[PDB]
Amino acid sequence: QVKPYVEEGLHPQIIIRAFRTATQLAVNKIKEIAVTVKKADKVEQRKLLEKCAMTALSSKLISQQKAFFAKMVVDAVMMLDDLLQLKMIGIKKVQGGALEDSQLVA
Amino acid sequence: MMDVDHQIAKLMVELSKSQDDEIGDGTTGVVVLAGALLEEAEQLLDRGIHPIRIADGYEQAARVAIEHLDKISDSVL
Amino acid sequence: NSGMNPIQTMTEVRARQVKEMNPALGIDCLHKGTNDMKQQHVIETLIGKKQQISLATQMVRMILKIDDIRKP
Amino acid sequence: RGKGAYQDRDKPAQIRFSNISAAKAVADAIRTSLGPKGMDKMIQDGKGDVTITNDGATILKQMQVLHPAARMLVELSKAQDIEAGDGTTSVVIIAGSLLDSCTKLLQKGIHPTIISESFQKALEKGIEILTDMSRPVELSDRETLLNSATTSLNSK
Amino acid sequence: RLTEYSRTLSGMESYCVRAFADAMEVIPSTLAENAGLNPISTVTELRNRHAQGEKTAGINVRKGGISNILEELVVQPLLVSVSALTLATETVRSILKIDDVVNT
Amino acid sequence: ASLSLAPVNIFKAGADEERAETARLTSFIGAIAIGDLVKSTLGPKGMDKILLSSGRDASLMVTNDGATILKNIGVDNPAAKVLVDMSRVQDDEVGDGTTSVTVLAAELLREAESLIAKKIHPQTIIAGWREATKAAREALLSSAVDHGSDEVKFRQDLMNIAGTTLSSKLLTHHKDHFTKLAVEAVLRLKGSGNLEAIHIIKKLGGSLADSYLDEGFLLDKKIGVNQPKRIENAKILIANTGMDTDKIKIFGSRVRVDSTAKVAEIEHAEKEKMKEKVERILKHGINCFINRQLIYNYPEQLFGAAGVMAIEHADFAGVERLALVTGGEIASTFDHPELVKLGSCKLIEEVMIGEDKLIHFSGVALGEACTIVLRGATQQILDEAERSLHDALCVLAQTVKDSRTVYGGGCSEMLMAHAVTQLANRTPGKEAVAMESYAKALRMLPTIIADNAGYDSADLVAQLRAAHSEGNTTAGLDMREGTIGDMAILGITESFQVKRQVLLSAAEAAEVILRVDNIIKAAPR
Amino acid sequence: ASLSLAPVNIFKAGADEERAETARLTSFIGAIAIGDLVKSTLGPKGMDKILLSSGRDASLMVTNDGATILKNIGVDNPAAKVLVDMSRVQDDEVGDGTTSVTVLAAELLREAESLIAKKIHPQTIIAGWREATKAAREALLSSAVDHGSDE
Amino acid sequence: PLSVFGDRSTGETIRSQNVMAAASIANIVKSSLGPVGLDKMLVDDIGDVTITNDGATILKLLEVEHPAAKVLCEL
Ligand SMILES: Nc1ncnc2c1ncn2[C@@H]1O[C@H](COP(=O)(O)OP(=O)(O)O)[C@@H](O)[C@H]1O
Ligand SMILES: Nc1ncnc2c1ncn2[C@@H]1O[C@H](COP(=O)(O)OP(=O)(O)O)[C@@H](O)[C@H]1O
Ligand SMILES: Nc1ncnc2c1ncn2[C@@H]1O[C@H](COP(=O)(O)OP(=O)(O)O)[C@@H](O)[C@H]1O
Ligand SMILES: [Mg+2]
Ligand SMILES: [Mg+2]
Ligand SMILES: [Mg+2]
Ligand SMILES: [Mg+2]
C-alpha cells in the first residue's frame, strides 16, 4: 500500500510515524471493543475455550473432527495445573487408524 | 519394495503400510479405493468444484458407508 | 480379474441387491455358480472394511488439500 | 459365457490411454481461450517471432505439440477452420472431452468399437437435434448478418 | 436430448451415449468458467431451463446469469456447430481405431 | 572349426558371422517379430498403427496397410528385410493380401522353428512344404468360381469384393457408400487397367461420408486472365506445345545485326510467329485449349481476345487424363486440323471445393478417367482413406482382368488346410509332419482373424475344420456375431489371384529363409 | 495408464517396471534359456560343461551336475533366479534330480507361454496344472514298489 | 501431458512478468522527463557514444528480449 508513495519520493520517516500512530490506535481499539465476560463461570469458560479451539482448528486437515479435537485440547489444558507447560502434554504418533481413533489419556 | 520418487506415490506406500499395521489385511484394497476416489475427484475438479468441497463430500459419504457397514454386519462365535 | 465383463456383472449384481433385500450378493470370482457370498462363505472382518474406507478417505482428503510443490 | 478371451497384450490399452491423455491435455490448454470472456495466448517460436492470438487453429498450429494425438487434433482444428472458419476452439474442446469420457468407458470394460458405433449414433441424433433447433435465414436481412458478425467478434 | 436418447437405448450403447452427452456438457461449463460464474450452478440452471422448454436459454455474461440470448443477439450459423460436431466425432472415431505406435 | 571360433581371425574389424543355430535363431526371431507386428491389423476387426517418423520431417502416419507399415520401419534383421520385400512385391502385384502374406510367412517360419527343434532336417521340411503348397494350390484352383459371363452376377461379385476389401480399413464406417463409389470408378475404366486414369483428390474438411465420385472430371489448374470462366458445348484441344518464349530449336542460331531498328524488327517477327501459331491453333475451331506446358502472357491475351479458355501447366498425367475423359488427341503440330480429334464435353466451369477453386468438366464424351474427391477431418484420415481406396481399386481391377473368385473369411484357408491334411495323412516320413505344420499355419491365419475380434478363436476354428472335413466347402467365419456361416450367402468373396499370390509368395519366402544356415555381415559403413 | 508409460515420472533414476507382455516375455525367455542350458546334460548320454570363472583365480570346473552348473553362473533374469534356487533346494533335499526338475520346469513354462498365446487366462492354466499334478502324484505313488523287507 | 518442447507460463505469473517488463522499460526513461530531466549516455560496446534525451532513440538503441518491452519500444 505504501509502495506508490515511496515511488513518489515521500520521506520514509513520515511513513514510519504514520504506521506507528495507526498501530497504536488499532491496538487500543482492539483492547477497547474486545468482548470479555466477568463471571468466571466454569461452563461459560469451557464453552469459550472450546469455541476458540474450534476456530483455531477450522483451517487444517483435521477440521472435520474439529469439535472432537477441540474438546480434547480443552480437557488437556484445563487439567494442566498452573504453568501450562507444553512438556506436560505428551504427543504420541502411531501409524494406522482413523483420526477418530485418536485418544487423550487421563 | 517399490522404488518411487514421486511424493504422492510415497503417500500411497505409507497408506498401505498403515493398513498393514492397523489391520494386516486389505492393504491392496485401500490403494485401489484411493485411486478411484482421486480419479473421480479429477472430473469433479474439471467442473469447477473446490477441492475442499470434494473432501467434505467424501467425508460425509464415508461416514454414511461406515454406518451402513455397521448396520449390515454379522457376528460370529 | 476373473475374466468376466466388469460393468455388466456389477450392474446385474447391484440390480439383484436392490430387488431382493440381500447385501451379501457379490462377484462370483471363482465361478461357483452363485452370487451369494454367505453360502460361498466369503467372510471379511468389519474392522478391516471400516479401516479401509477411513484410511482411504483421510489420505484422499490430504492429497486433495495440497496445491503447491517445491521440490529442488 | 464364462472367462472369455484373455486380454494377453494390454499394450493397446496403454497406447489408447496415452492418446486420450494427450488430447485432454491439449483441450485443457486451449480451454481458457473460449467465449466472450476468454483471453489471448502468447506464443514465441524458435525464432524471435511473437504471436498474440485467440484463434484456436492459430494457437494449435503455432506451438509444436510432438504427440500424435495432439497433432491429429491440430489437423482437426485446421479442417474446421477450412470448412467453417470459427469454432476451431470448440471442436478441439469437444474432441478432448469425448476422449476423456472414452477413458472411463474403456475402463468399464467396453471394446473401443462399440464406443465408436455408439458415438456415430449419438452424432446422427445430435445432427437431427441441431437441425430441429435451427431457424431459417435469408441474406436480405442485414440485422441477422450484423448479429452473427458481432457474435463472432465478441471473443477477440 | 442425447441423455434422453440414451435412456431410450440399452446395453453398453446407453452408457456410451450418456458419456457422449456428458462430454457435450463441457462447453457450457467452460463458458460459465472464464466468466466468474459458478460452473455447476450455471450448468444445472441451463439444463433445468432447457428441460422446461426454453430452447434458447444460454449463458448471459452481460447480466452475469442465464437468460434468453436471442434478445442478447448472440447467434451463430448452423454450419458451425454441425461441422464441429461432425469433425470431432470423425476424429474421435479415427483415434479409437488405433492400438500401437511404431517409430520410423 | 568355424571362422569366428578359430585361433586365427579371418575377418575385417566389425565383420562377423553366425553359424547354424545362431543364424536360424536370428532369422526366426526377426520373422516372428515382423509377423507379430503386422498382425492384429488383420481382418474386419483389426486396428491401425501410428508411424511416428523420427526424422527431420517427423511425419505422422496412421495406417492399416501392412505394406506401408513394413516399408516405413528401420529394419536391420536380414530375414525381416526378406519379409518386407515380400510384402512390397505383394503390394506391387496385387493391391491386397500384404498382411495376409506376411502373417502366413511368419507362421510358416514359426512351425519350421518347432520342427527344427524336433530334430528334422530343413530340407525335409522344404520338400514337405513344396508338396503341401502344390496340394493347396490345386485345392484353391478347384475352389474358384467364375461369374464374368453374367453381367449382374459379376457386378454383385464386384460389390462383394470391394466391400470385403474395405471391411478392414477405416472406410468400414461407410463401407456401402465407399464400395459403390469404388465399383463405379473401376467400371468407368472400360476394362483398361491403368489406375493412373483414376485421380484421388484429398481436400481437408467435411465428413468422410462427403466424399464422392464426380460424374465428370476435375482439374486443379487455373485459367488465363481475360478468358471465359464457363463454356457450354466445349470443343477441347489438348496440346503439348511450348508456347513459352518459343525458340527455334537450332541451338547455334543467334541474332547479329548492326542497328537496334533491326533488333526491333526481329522481335516483331518473333511475336508475329507466335501470333501465327495461335492463329493456327484457333483454326481448329475450339473453345477450350489445354496445354501441358506453360503459357506466357502474349499467347494468353491472344486466347483471351478470341474467347478461348487456356488451361496451362497440366502435367503429363493431366493431359493423359483429359484425353481419356474427353476423347481428345494430345497434339503438338497444327498444320493439319482435319487430322486432330477434339475432345468434347457438355460444360466447363469453376467449382468451389473447400477453400479452393477447381475446373470442372461435366457431361464428358468418353469418361474413361475418374476423379474422386476425398473429404476428411484430418490429414491422416485423408491419407488412410486414399490408401484404402487404392487397395479397393487395385483389387477390383484385378478382378476385372481375371473374374475367378474365391470365398474369404478363412474359408479358403480351411479348404487349403483340409487338402494339405488329406495329403499328409497318406504320406510316410517326417514330410507328413512338415505338411501338418503347413496346415497348422494355414489354419492359424483365420485363428488370428478371430482373435482380433475377441472371439473364441479356438472353438470357431475347430468348428470350421469340422465343417470342411464334413463337406461344407463354403463354411467361413461370420464376423457379425461370432459364429460360422455360409460365405456364398453372406457375400464375402475375394479375388482368386490375390489368394493364390498370397499362398505362393508366403511359401516362397518361407522356403528361401529356411534354406539359410549362416549369416555373414560385412563391416558396416 | 501405466506406472511407467505415464506423463508424470514415478520412479527413481534407474528404477524400471515391466508390464504384462514384457514381464511374461522376460520370465519365459529366462526360464527357457535356463532349461536349454542345463539340458543336453541329461540321461546316460548327457555331456559335461566347462565353467570358467572370470575372477582372479579363474577357477576351472568341468561338471555334469545341474545344480553346480546353475549355481556358478551370472544370472540376472529373476525367473532364472527362481529356477536356480529351485534346483539348489532340490539338491539339498535329495542328491539327484537337479537337472530333471529344471528341465521339467522350463518345459512347463514353455507350454504356459504357448497357452497364453492361445488366449488362456493364467489362472485357468494354474488350476489345470494343480489338478494334473495331483493326478500324476497319485499315479506315481500307486506305481511305487517297496523291497525294504527282503534283504 | 502437453509434451510441447518449450516453457509455459500461465495466470498471475505471466501477467506479473509482463507488468515487470513494462515497468522496467518505463523506469529506463522515466528520468528524462520535463525541464529538470537529465540526458543519458549510451555506450555501444565498440566505444560508440550516444548522448540523448529522446525516448525513441534510447529505446531503439537498447536491445530488448522481452516481447512486452518490445511492444512499448515500438509504441
Ligand atoms: N456475447 C456472448 N455471450 C455468450 N456467449 C458467447 C458470446 N459471444 C460468443 N459466445 C460463445 O463463445 C463460444 C466460443 O467462441 P470463440 O471464443 O469465438 O471461439 P470459437 O468461435 O473458435 O469457438 C461460441 O460458441 C459462442 O457461443
Ligand atoms: N466381412 C468379412 N468377413 C470375414 N472375413 C473378412 C471380411 N472382410 C475381410 N475379411 C478377411 O480379412 C483378411 C485380411 O484382409 P485385409 O486386412 O483387409 O487385407 P490384407 O489381406 O492385406 O490383410 C482377408 O483374408 C479376409 O478373408
Ligand atoms: N541307464 C539308464 N537308462 C535309461 N535312463 C536312465 C539311465 N540312467 C539314468 N537315466 C535317466 O536319466 C534321467 C536324468 O538323470 P541324470 O541325467 O543322472 O541327472 P539328474 O537326475 O540330476 O537329472 C533320470 O530321470 C533317469 O531316469
Ligand atoms: Mg486379503
Ligand atoms: Mg468464433
Ligand atoms: Mg485387404
Ligand atoms: Mg541324475
Side-chain angles (χ1 to χ4, degrees), chain F residues 231-237 285-288 309 342-348 361-362:
Chain F
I231 53 180
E232 317 200 42
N233 313 127
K235 292 178 287 298
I236 312 162
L237 165 73
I286 60 174
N287 287 349
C288 181
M309 293 177 70
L342 309 177
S344 161
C345 65
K346 282 294 182 66
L347 183 63
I348 311 189
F361 300 83
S362 173

PDB file of all heavy atoms in Angstrom, chain F residues 231-237 285-288 309 342-348 361-362:
ATOM      1  N   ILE F 231     -17.953 -22.333 -70.331  1.00  0.00           N
ATOM      2  CA  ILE F 231     -18.343 -22.534 -71.720  1.00  0.00           C
ATOM      3  C   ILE F 231     -19.268 -23.737 -71.804  1.00  0.00           C
ATOM      4  O   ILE F 231     -19.152 -24.689 -71.029  1.00  0.00           O
ATOM      5  CB  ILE F 231     -17.127 -22.727 -72.648  1.00  0.00           C
ATOM      6  CG1 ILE F 231     -16.224 -23.835 -72.120  1.00  0.00           C
ATOM      7  CG2 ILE F 231     -16.345 -21.435 -72.784  1.00  0.00           C
ATOM      8  CD1 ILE F 231     -15.015 -24.068 -72.981  1.00  0.00           C
ATOM      9  N   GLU F 232     -20.186 -23.689 -72.762  1.00  0.00           N
ATOM     10  CA  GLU F 232     -21.145 -24.757 -72.992  1.00  0.00           C
ATOM     11  C   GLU F 232     -20.873 -25.396 -74.344  1.00  0.00           C
ATOM     12  O   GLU F 232     -20.568 -24.698 -75.317  1.00  0.00           O
ATOM     13  CB  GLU F 232     -22.577 -24.226 -72.940  1.00  0.00           C
ATOM     14  CG  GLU F 232     -22.827 -23.260 -71.801  1.00  0.00           C
ATOM     15  CD  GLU F 232     -24.295 -23.131 -71.456  1.00  0.00           C
ATOM     16  OE1 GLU F 232     -24.994 -24.164 -71.428  1.00  0.00           O
ATOM     17  OE2 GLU F 232     -24.751 -21.995 -71.213  1.00  0.00           O
ATOM     18  N   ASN F 233     -20.984 -26.722 -74.398  1.00  0.00           N
ATOM     19  CA  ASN F 233     -20.630 -27.499 -75.583  1.00  0.00           C
ATOM     20  C   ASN F 233     -19.188 -27.208 -75.999  1.00  0.00           C
ATOM     21  O   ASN F 233     -18.909 -26.714 -77.091  1.00  0.00           O
ATOM     22  CB  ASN F 233     -21.607 -27.231 -76.732  1.00  0.00           C
ATOM     23  CG  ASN F 233     -23.049 -27.283 -76.288  1.00  0.00           C
ATOM     24  OD1 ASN F 233     -23.814 -26.348 -76.514  1.00  0.00           O
ATOM     25  ND2 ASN F 233     -23.429 -28.380 -75.647  1.00  0.00           N
ATOM     26  N   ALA F 234     -18.274 -27.515 -75.086  1.00  0.00           N
ATOM     27  CA  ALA F 234     -16.865 -27.244 -75.312  1.00  0.00           C
ATOM     28  C   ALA F 234     -16.298 -28.155 -76.393  1.00  0.00           C
ATOM     29  O   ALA F 234     -16.718 -29.301 -76.559  1.00  0.00           O
ATOM     30  CB  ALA F 234     -16.079 -27.426 -74.019  1.00  0.00           C
ATOM     31  N   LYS F 235     -15.334 -27.621 -77.136  1.00  0.00           N
ATOM     32  CA  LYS F 235     -14.559 -28.367 -78.123  1.00  0.00           C
ATOM     33  C   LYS F 235     -13.101 -28.245 -77.697  1.00  0.00           C
ATOM     34  O   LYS F 235     -12.403 -27.307 -78.086  1.00  0.00           O
ATOM     35  CB  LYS F 235     -14.793 -27.840 -79.524  1.00  0.00           C
ATOM     36  CG  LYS F 235     -16.191 -28.098 -80.042  1.00  0.00           C
ATOM     37  CD  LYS F 235     -16.387 -27.499 -81.418  1.00  0.00           C
ATOM     38  CE  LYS F 235     -16.487 -25.986 -81.344  1.00  0.00           C
ATOM     39  NZ  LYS F 235     -17.651 -25.547 -80.530  1.00  0.00           N
ATOM     40  N   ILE F 236     -12.649 -29.195 -76.895  1.00  0.00           N
ATOM     41  CA  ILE F 236     -11.357 -29.094 -76.231  1.00  0.00           C
ATOM     42  C   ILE F 236     -10.254 -29.573 -77.160  1.00  0.00           C
ATOM     43  O   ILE F 236     -10.397 -30.585 -77.856  1.00  0.00           O
ATOM     44  CB  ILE F 236     -11.367 -29.899 -74.923  1.00  0.00           C
ATOM     45  CG1 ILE F 236     -12.618 -29.574 -74.111  1.00  0.00           C
ATOM     46  CG2 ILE F 236     -10.124 -29.613 -74.114  1.00  0.00           C
ATOM     47  CD1 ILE F 236     -12.936 -30.595 -73.062  1.00  0.00           C
ATOM     48  N   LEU F 237      -9.145 -28.842 -77.173  1.00  0.00           N
ATOM     49  CA  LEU F 237      -7.934 -29.242 -77.877  1.00  0.00           C
ATOM     50  C   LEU F 237      -6.815 -29.382 -76.857  1.00  0.00           C
ATOM     51  O   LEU F 237      -6.433 -28.400 -76.214  1.00  0.00           O
ATOM     52  CB  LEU F 237      -7.555 -28.223 -78.951  1.00  0.00           C
ATOM     53  CG  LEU F 237      -6.136 -28.346 -79.500  1.00  0.00           C
ATOM     54  CD1 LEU F 237      -6.019 -29.551 -80.408  1.00  0.00           C
ATOM     55  CD2 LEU F 237      -5.744 -27.087 -80.235  1.00  0.00           C
ATOM     56  N   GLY F 285     -11.106 -24.470 -84.610  1.00  0.00           N
ATOM     57  CA  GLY F 285     -12.457 -24.211 -84.157  1.00  0.00           C
ATOM     58  C   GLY F 285     -12.705 -24.754 -82.769  1.00  0.00           C
ATOM     59  O   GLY F 285     -13.498 -25.680 -82.590  1.00  0.00           O
ATOM     60  N   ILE F 286     -12.031 -24.183 -81.774  1.00  0.00           N
ATOM     61  CA  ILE F 286     -12.049 -24.713 -80.421  1.00  0.00           C
ATOM     62  C   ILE F 286     -12.624 -23.672 -79.472  1.00  0.00           C
ATOM     63  O   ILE F 286     -12.692 -22.480 -79.774  1.00  0.00           O
ATOM     64  CB  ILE F 286     -10.646 -25.140 -79.955  1.00  0.00           C
ATOM     65  CG1 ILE F 286      -9.700 -23.943 -79.986  1.00  0.00           C
ATOM     66  CG2 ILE F 286     -10.118 -26.246 -80.834  1.00  0.00           C
ATOM     67  CD1 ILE F 286      -8.346 -24.229 -79.401  1.00  0.00           C
ATOM     68  N   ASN F 287     -13.047 -24.151 -78.306  1.00  0.00           N
ATOM     69  CA  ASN F 287     -13.483 -23.308 -77.202  1.00  0.00           C
ATOM     70  C   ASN F 287     -12.488 -23.311 -76.056  1.00  0.00           C
ATOM     71  O   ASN F 287     -12.108 -22.250 -75.559  1.00  0.00           O
ATOM     72  CB  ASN F 287     -14.851 -23.772 -76.689  1.00  0.00           C
ATOM     73  CG  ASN F 287     -15.971 -23.425 -77.632  1.00  0.00           C
ATOM     74  OD1 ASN F 287     -15.786 -22.660 -78.576  1.00  0.00           O
ATOM     75  ND2 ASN F 287     -17.146 -23.986 -77.383  1.00  0.00           N
ATOM     76  N   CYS F 288     -12.057 -24.490 -75.624  1.00  0.00           N
ATOM     77  CA  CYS F 288     -11.122 -24.643 -74.522  1.00  0.00           C
ATOM     78  C   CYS F 288      -9.829 -25.240 -75.047  1.00  0.00           C
ATOM     79  O   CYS F 288      -9.853 -26.214 -75.805  1.00  0.00           O
ATOM     80  CB  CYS F 288     -11.704 -25.534 -73.427  1.00  0.00           C
ATOM     81  SG  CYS F 288     -10.626 -25.770 -72.008  1.00  0.00           S
ATOM     82  N   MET F 309     -10.714 -20.531 -73.505  1.00  0.00           N
ATOM     83  CA  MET F 309     -10.067 -20.936 -72.266  1.00  0.00           C
ATOM     84  C   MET F 309      -8.700 -21.533 -72.560  1.00  0.00           C
ATOM     85  O   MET F 309      -8.537 -22.324 -73.492  1.00  0.00           O
ATOM     86  CB  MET F 309     -10.928 -21.952 -71.521  1.00  0.00           C
ATOM     87  CG  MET F 309     -12.233 -21.400 -71.005  1.00  0.00           C
ATOM     88  SD  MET F 309     -13.241 -22.661 -70.212  1.00  0.00           S
ATOM     89  CE  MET F 309     -12.297 -22.956 -68.724  1.00  0.00           C
ATOM     90  N   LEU F 342     -10.816 -33.482 -81.533  1.00  0.00           N
ATOM     91  CA  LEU F 342     -11.034 -32.552 -80.437  1.00  0.00           C
ATOM     92  C   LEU F 342     -11.935 -33.189 -79.390  1.00  0.00           C
ATOM     93  O   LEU F 342     -12.990 -33.735 -79.724  1.00  0.00           O
ATOM     94  CB  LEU F 342     -11.665 -31.256 -80.942  1.00  0.00           C
ATOM     95  CG  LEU F 342     -10.964 -30.586 -82.116  1.00  0.00           C
ATOM     96  CD1 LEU F 342     -11.739 -29.365 -82.560  1.00  0.00           C
ATOM     97  CD2 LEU F 342      -9.553 -30.213 -81.725  1.00  0.00           C
ATOM     98  N   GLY F 343     -11.516 -33.116 -78.132  1.00  0.00           N
ATOM     99  CA  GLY F 343     -12.366 -33.577 -77.055  1.00  0.00           C
ATOM    100  C   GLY F 343     -13.569 -32.673 -76.873  1.00  0.00           C
ATOM    101  O   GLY F 343     -13.531 -31.478 -77.158  1.00  0.00           O
ATOM    102  N   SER F 344     -14.659 -33.259 -76.391  1.00  0.00           N
ATOM    103  CA  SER F 344     -15.900 -32.530 -76.199  1.00  0.00           C
ATOM    104  C   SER F 344     -16.502 -32.873 -74.846  1.00  0.00           C
ATOM    105  O   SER F 344     -16.356 -33.991 -74.348  1.00  0.00           O
ATOM    106  CB  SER F 344     -16.909 -32.843 -77.306  1.00  0.00           C
ATOM    107  OG  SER F 344     -18.223 -32.506 -76.900  1.00  0.00           O
ATOM    108  N   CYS F 345     -17.177 -31.892 -74.254  1.00  0.00           N
ATOM    109  CA  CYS F 345     -17.914 -32.104 -73.020  1.00  0.00           C
ATOM    110  C   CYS F 345     -19.032 -31.080 -72.942  1.00  0.00           C
ATOM    111  O   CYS F 345     -18.989 -30.034 -73.592  1.00  0.00           O
ATOM    112  CB  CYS F 345     -17.007 -32.011 -71.792  1.00  0.00           C
ATOM    113  SG  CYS F 345     -16.299 -30.390 -71.522  1.00  0.00           S
ATOM    114  N   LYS F 346     -20.043 -31.398 -72.133  1.00  0.00           N
ATOM    115  CA  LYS F 346     -21.238 -30.563 -72.079  1.00  0.00           C
ATOM    116  C   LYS F 346     -20.946 -29.196 -71.478  1.00  0.00           C
ATOM    117  O   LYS F 346     -21.450 -28.180 -71.967  1.00  0.00           O
ATOM    118  CB  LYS F 346     -22.330 -31.268 -71.279  1.00  0.00           C
ATOM    119  CG  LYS F 346     -23.055 -32.354 -72.044  1.00  0.00           C
ATOM    120  CD  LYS F 346     -23.844 -31.779 -73.200  1.00  0.00           C
ATOM    121  CE  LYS F 346     -24.598 -32.871 -73.935  1.00  0.00           C
ATOM    122  NZ  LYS F 346     -25.648 -33.480 -73.075  1.00  0.00           N
ATOM    123  N   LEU F 347     -20.139 -29.145 -70.422  1.00  0.00           N
ATOM    124  CA  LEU F 347     -19.964 -27.906 -69.680  1.00  0.00           C
ATOM    125  C   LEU F 347     -18.604 -27.894 -69.001  1.00  0.00           C
ATOM    126  O   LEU F 347     -18.165 -28.911 -68.463  1.00  0.00           O
ATOM    127  CB  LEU F 347     -21.069 -27.738 -68.635  1.00  0.00           C
ATOM    128  CG  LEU F 347     -21.062 -26.453 -67.812  1.00  0.00           C
ATOM    129  CD1 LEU F 347     -21.261 -25.249 -68.707  1.00  0.00           C
ATOM    130  CD2 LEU F 347     -22.132 -26.508 -66.742  1.00  0.00           C
ATOM    131  N   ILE F 348     -17.951 -26.736 -69.032  1.00  0.00           N
ATOM    132  CA  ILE F 348     -16.744 -26.474 -68.261  1.00  0.00           C
ATOM    133  C   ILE F 348     -17.009 -25.260 -67.388  1.00  0.00           C
ATOM    134  O   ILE F 348     -17.509 -24.240 -67.875  1.00  0.00           O
ATOM    135  CB  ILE F 348     -15.520 -26.231 -69.159  1.00  0.00           C
ATOM    136  CG1 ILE F 348     -15.409 -27.314 -70.224  1.00  0.00           C
ATOM    137  CG2 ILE F 348     -14.260 -26.187 -68.326  1.00  0.00           C
ATOM    138  CD1 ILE F 348     -14.120 -27.264 -70.997  1.00  0.00           C
ATOM    139  N   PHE F 361     -15.230 -30.414 -65.416  1.00  0.00           N
ATOM    140  CA  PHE F 361     -15.720 -30.845 -66.716  1.00  0.00           C
ATOM    141  C   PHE F 361     -16.956 -31.708 -66.510  1.00  0.00           C
ATOM    142  O   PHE F 361     -16.906 -32.700 -65.779  1.00  0.00           O
ATOM    143  CB  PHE F 361     -14.652 -31.631 -67.475  1.00  0.00           C
ATOM    144  CG  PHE F 361     -13.397 -30.856 -67.740  1.00  0.00           C
ATOM    145  CD1 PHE F 361     -12.413 -30.753 -66.777  1.00  0.00           C
ATOM    146  CD2 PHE F 361     -13.196 -30.237 -68.957  1.00  0.00           C
ATOM    147  CE1 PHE F 361     -11.259 -30.043 -67.020  1.00  0.00           C
ATOM    148  CE2 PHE F 361     -12.044 -29.529 -69.205  1.00  0.00           C
ATOM    149  CZ  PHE F 361     -11.075 -29.433 -68.235  1.00  0.00           C
ATOM    150  N   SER F 362     -18.056 -31.334 -67.150  1.00  0.00           N
ATOM    151  CA  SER F 362     -19.324 -32.018 -66.969  1.00  0.00           C
ATOM    152  C   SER F 362     -19.850 -32.519 -68.305  1.00  0.00           C
ATOM    153  O   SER F 362     -19.643 -31.891 -69.347  1.00  0.00           O
ATOM    154  CB  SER F 362     -20.359 -31.102 -66.318  1.00  0.00           C
ATOM    155  OG  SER F 362     -21.632 -31.721 -66.291  1.00  0.00           O
TER     156      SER F 362
END
